[PDB]
Amino acid sequence: AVDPIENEEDRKKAVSNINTLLDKADRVYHQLMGHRPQLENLLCKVNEAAPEKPTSASVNRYILQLAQEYCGDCKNSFDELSKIIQKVFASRKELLEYDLQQRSQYRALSTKCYGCASAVTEHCITLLRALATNPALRHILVSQGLIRELFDYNLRRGAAAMREEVRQLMCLLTRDNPEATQQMNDLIIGKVSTALKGHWANPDLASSLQYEMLLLTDSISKE
Amino acid sequence: ASNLMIEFADFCHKCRSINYDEKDPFLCNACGFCKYARFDFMLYAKPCCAVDPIENEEDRKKAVSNINTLLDKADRVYHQLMGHRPQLENLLCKVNEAAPEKPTSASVNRYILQLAQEYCGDCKN
Numbered sequence: 146a147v148d149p150i151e152n153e154e155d156r157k158k159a160v161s162n163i164n165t166l167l168d169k170a171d172r173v174y175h176q177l178m179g180h181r182p183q184l185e186n187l188l189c190k191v192n193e194a195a196p197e198k199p200t201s202a203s204v205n206r207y208i209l210q211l212a213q214e215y216c217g218d219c220k221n222s223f224d225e226l227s228k229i230i231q232k233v234f235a236s237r238k239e240l241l242e243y244d245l246q247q248r249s250q251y252r253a254l255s256t257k258c259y260g261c262a263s264a265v266t267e268h269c270i271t272l273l274r275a276l277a278t279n280p281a282l283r284h285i286l287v288s289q290g291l292i293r294e295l296f297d298y299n300l301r302r303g304a305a306a307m308r309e310e311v312r313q314l315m316c317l318l319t320r321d322n323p324e325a326t327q328q329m330n331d332l333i334i335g336k337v338s339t340a341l342k343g344h345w346a347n348p349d350l351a352s353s354l355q356y357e358m359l360l361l362t363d364s365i366s367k368e
Numbered sequence: 369a370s371n372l373m374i375e376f377a378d379f380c381h382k383c384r385s386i387n388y389d390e391k392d393p394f395l396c397n398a399c400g401f402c403k404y405a406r407f408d409f410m411l412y413a414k415p416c417c418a419v420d421p422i423e424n425e426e427d428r429k430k431a432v433s434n435i436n437t438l439l440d441k442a443d444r445v446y447h448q449l450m451g452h453r454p455q456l457e458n459l460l461c462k463v464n465e466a467a468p469e470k471p472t473s474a475s476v477n478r479y480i481l482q483l484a485q486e487y488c489g490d491c492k493n
Contacts, residue, residue, distance in 0.1 A: 200481075200484050200485040200488045200489045201473070203484040203485075203487075203488035203489075204476060204480065204481075204484055208476065209472075209476075212472040212475040212476055213472040213475075215472075215475075216472035216475040217472045303468075304467065304468055304469075305465065305467035305468070305469075308467075352464065355464060355465070
């Protein structure tokens with residue numbers, strides 16, 4: 146928090162502190178964003194995946210460098226920026242309260258947040274899993290074609306628990322809908338065959354089929 | 369070779385082992401206390417693995433026994449080494465999942481560190 150603002154001198158001191166905190170936060174944000182280009186270069190080096198000759202040191206050197214950069218530098222910079230932002234917000238709130246004092250409805254008187262979007266997705270997955278129980282709702286949702294969206298976008302991304310929950314939800318969505326089962330089987334078979342076409346050409350193609358196979362196994366498991 | 373004998377071909381003070389036989393030897397017959405001098409040695413050598421020459425039929429039998437024993441030990445070692453394969457496969461499967469998880473020396477994925485320890489540590493040895 147900040148000292149209460151009761152006089153014009155206190156308001157001026159709060160304004161000066163807010164300006165100084167803004168400058169410090171700008172510097173911290175610039176420093177944090179600086180690591181981004183180096184992070185990109187390190188990511189490029191790692192994506193090369195080139196074998197190299199030399200157990201704590203057994204890992205790829207680029208991987209260790211990236212871990213040190215992000216977990217060590219980026220985390221510290223983010224923490225400092227968050228602390229500065231919290232202090233600035235507290236000062237602004239105190240100044241606004243002082244100005245209002247000088248001067249439902251009474252109670253009334255970030256968008257690009259990847260974590261927030263992920264939480265929204267997880268909550269949506271849980272809610273869909275719940276709503277799946279009503280068989281009529283199940284048919285309605287299948288008509289909405291959520292199966293394709295789930296397979297396409299949310300199937301692979303997200304946490305492992307999210308992956309298992311999504312597999313369960315997909316299974317439940319195809320509880321007894323023969324047309325839906327046919328559609329899902331068709332999608333899985335198509336992806337598998339497309340991968341198998343270039344099997345002799347790309348090991349990664351074989352590598353990137355695990356989720357579909359797990360989904361098929363889960364579907365077969367539920368009688 | 370494995371053993372050597374170096375003699376001062378042409379030409380106690382430490383252990384007080386008075387060699388009644390050799391009054392003034394180059395070195396003590398017991399202590400090697402060399403009143404004449406002290407000698408240090410070094411060799412531009414590389415370690416070598418070999419066996420003593422087999423000259424008698426008894427040497428042949430001893431060699432056959434040693435070979436059988438070495439074969440048995442090697443079989444045990446080979447079975448042990450081949451054993452690590454399934455664990456490595458399971459760890460590789462877990463890593464291929466690439467499941468995000470929450471907790472920079474230890475910042476890496478736990479599966480990755482475990483796989484590194486298994487392969488680089490056990491398999492190499």
